[PDB]
Amino acid sequence: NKQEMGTYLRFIVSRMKERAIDLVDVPTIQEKVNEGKYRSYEEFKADAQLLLHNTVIFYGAASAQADIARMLYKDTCHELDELQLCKNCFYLSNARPDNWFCYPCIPNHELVWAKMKGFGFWPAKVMQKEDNQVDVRFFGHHHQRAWIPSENIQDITVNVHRLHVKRSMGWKKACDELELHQRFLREGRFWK
Amino acid sequence: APSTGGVKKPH
Ligand SMILES: [Zn+2]
């Protein structure tokens, strides 16, 4: 996918320029993406790596600039990890049309109630799992991520009154978003 | 915050 990769990489570069306002060349990577020249994510990663190295050498391994660069390289690698987890999620998370988190993916994310100590059960999408814990992304404001122990999870088709919940404004908005998602899912309303 | 969400802080 020539254009798809190009689109994703543009989000990353743009975001890392925004990250960089904390306080190989950047235009070169910026040039390369803009022209859609990258042939692999791995190749993009190796350029970001080169840039990091040149940067730390340029300014000193303990400069403010080298600290920034190390942070940016880690964030870029995180964005690339996430892009591999689910490309649709990544696209919608960056383009953010109205109700972006409600559009289904293929395959569909498993939906759960996930409990974090002190918050009660909150609705979430499962992004990945291992035997002892599950990486979820919550519905509702900020759409944050947590690793949740297996026994702090219930499937979404369990009735909510059977669960320990704390019914805040934020919790109610999360639940409204969940139900909109469940509807889009049954409708086959994919993002176009 | 990462595009696909920052880590949710414990209570
Ligand atoms: Zn997804």
Mind giving me the DSSP string for A149-167? EGGGEEETTS-GGGS-B--
CB contact under 8 A, A137 and B7: no
- The reply to whether CATH 3.20.20.140 applies to domain A103-192 is no
- Locate CATH 1.20.920.10 in chain A: 1-96
Token output for A1: 């996918």
Q: What is the C-alpha separation between A179 and A127, in angstroms, rounded?
A: 18
Of A90, A117, A146, the CB nearest to B4: A90
CB contact under 8 A, B5 and A75: no
Experimental method, per PDB record: X-ray
Chain B residues touching A116 at Cβ < 8 A? 8, 10-11
Of B6, B10, B11, the CB nearest to A145: B6
Resolution for this experimental structure (Å): 2.0
Strand (E) or helix (H) holding A121: strand A120-130
Q: Taking CA atoms, what residue in A is nearest to B6? A: A144
**Best CA proximity match to A12, nearest among B7, B2, B10:** B2
Q: A25 CB contacts (<8 Å, ≥6 apart)?
A: A51
HEC letters along A38-91: CCCHHHHHHHHHHHHHHHHHHHCCCCHHHHHHHHHHHHHHHHHHHHHHCHHHHH
User: What protein residues have CB closer than 5 angstroms to ion ligand 1?
Assistant: A 86, 88-89, 105
CATH of region A1-96, choose from 2.30.130.10, 3.40.109.10, 1.20.920.10, 3.30.2010.10: 1.20.920.10
